[PDB]
Symmetry: C2
Subunit: 452 residues, 2 copies
């Protein structure tokens, strides 16, 4: 027992084995981790050999020297992929962020008056113009955007909402569970599938401080189903003197039909010009910018929200703020194609095949590869457009040696890693989400796994 462990060398001795091989710091860390795995494996009597030690210690070093979060090549064809980090950023934005983070900036400083200033002041100019709302505000994310409006205007008082709009988006967010913690009392009207206007108007009373509607972003209902029109709820509010609050969620900044895609998804400008008092949404969904809770509406309300002592715990960071301004700057200049998420969904059907076969031309040489391009209909929107179904070209592949399952697995372990769909033992690569500079990296990773 006590000889199968004395064996394990000394950390000073393996540090030497890797003089300039690897940084001394990373070597000792790998030696300790490895030194402990052999002390316990020999104590339980499951190891008789120690030759695996030297080879392993170097593997920990090779592993411990790489950050965990890593860029990932998305081949699934889902633009708003909740799991892969939603809306990706254009180089233009990322450099504007790079520069403001490089050194000091006038984040909370107004250069004119030479005294402290509100950091939320830089942006709001853009929002008010783009939406048409009276005033605006921005916080960490939309989850908090909701929580803030409720605790600001309905703490202790009733909020009416349709029983079909109490959603569970994400793993931890649930309108009913957060609104609870929001301090607002929840008044659910109508039924799951159907909800008329009479349901809303019927539950109003002395405590009703808010009429709230949530947009079913991550799901939808078909069959016998009724919903309350937006113009109707504005009318109902202005009748009793109650505010209207729409949680768009998708955070669509513009009309979407303007780009060829025909859908009813709501957007700020239009929802604002409808008579709604407040509107919110995430910046990293249909806006295509960094994570951000966006609120626009009546000035008297925005000012009530801002003054809330909880807004300081949600106030946005220096990175997303800047990055959001450049994203908004692009919107004013109509540079639509510059923002990843808008370009990916409004891409020419022709455009997609053009990239579908430019990849197939790069994989015909690789050994054992069965390459075919198929025209499939998928659902692009992951966290904002549930029903949408648009055509896109998938380059379906298949190797004689390895199986589709094992294939996805190694591809997610590659550097860079690639995540893709699987359908009937045929790995699939949706080109709707693939950047050009990835095509070269796709071919170089597949040739390293099948010819190695």
């Amino acid at each position: 027992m006590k000889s199968l462990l004395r064996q394990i060398p000394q950390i000073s001795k393996v540090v030497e084995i890797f003089a300039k091989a690897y940084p001394e710091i990373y070597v000792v860390k790998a030696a300790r981790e490895v030194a402990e795995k052999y002390r316990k494996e020999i104590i339980e009597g499951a190891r008789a050999d120690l030759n695996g030690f030297l080879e392993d210690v170097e593997r920990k070093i090779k592993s411990l020297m790489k950050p965990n979060i890593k860029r990932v090549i998305n081949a699934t064809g889902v633009v708003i992929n909740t799991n892969l980090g939603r809306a990706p950023l254009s180089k233009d934005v990322i450099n504007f962020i790079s520069e403001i983070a490089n050194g000091y900036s006038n984040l909370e400083y107004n250069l004119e008056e030479g005294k402290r200033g509100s950091r939320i002041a830089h942006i709001e100019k853009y929002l008010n113009e783009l939406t048409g709302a009276e005033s605006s505000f921005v916080v960490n994310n939309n989850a908090g955007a909701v929580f803030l409006v409720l605790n600001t205007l309905a703490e202790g008082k009733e909020v009416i909402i349709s029983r079909g709009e109490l959603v569970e988006i994400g793993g931890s967010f649930r309108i009913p569970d957060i609104m609870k913690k929001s301090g607002a009392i929840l008044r659910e009207v109508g039924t799951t599938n159907k909800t008329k206007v009479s349901d809303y108007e019927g539950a109003i009373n002395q405590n009703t401080a808010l009429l709230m509607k949530v947009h079913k972003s991550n799901f939808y209902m078909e069959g016998f189903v009724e919903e309350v029109k937006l113009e109707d709820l504005v009318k109902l509010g202005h009748k009793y003197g109650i505010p209207t609050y729409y949680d768009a969620g998708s955070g669509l900044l513009i009309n979407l039909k303007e780009f060829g895609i025909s859908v009813d998804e709501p957007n700020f400008r239009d929802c604002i010009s409808l008579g709604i008092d407040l509107v919110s949404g995430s910046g990293d969904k249909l806006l295509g910018g960094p994570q951000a809770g966006i609120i626009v509406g009546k000035k008297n309300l925005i000012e009530k929200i801002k003054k809330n002592p909880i807004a300081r715990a949600l106030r946005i960071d220096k990175l997303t703020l800047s990055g959001l301004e450049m994203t908004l700057k692009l919107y004013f200049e109509k540079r639509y194609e510059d923002i990843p998420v808008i370009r990916m969904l409004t891409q020419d059907e022709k455009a997609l095949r053009q990239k579908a076969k430019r990849l197939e031309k790069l994989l015909k040489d690789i050994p054992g590869l069965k390459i075919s391009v198929i025209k499939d209909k998928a659902k692009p929107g992951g966290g904002s457009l549930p029903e949408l179904e648009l055509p896109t070209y998938c380059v379906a592949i298949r190797h004689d040696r390895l199986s589709s399952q094992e294939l996805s697995r190694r591809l997610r372990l590659a550097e860079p890693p690639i995540v893709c769909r699987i359908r009937e033992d045929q790995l699939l690569f949706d080109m709707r989400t693939v950047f050009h500079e990835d095509l070269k990296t796709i071919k170089k990773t597949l040739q390293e796994l099948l010819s190695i």
Copy 2:
């Protein structure tokens, strides 16, 4: 926050007795904030951190320190001699 605030001691001075004196059935937290953007000199007393933890483990109450500065390491190791607290040491 929804938490009920029980302020002990006085501005410039605060002994341990002050903390231990306000505990009761509803006391669910013993919280200390580090004065990050200001400081008091002259007749000023503070409760040693070690004593707060001792008081917590006596009555079975958790201790919560808002360092604020977020100092990850000992600062004296770099030539600057200050008593600024840090995660490692405070933990």
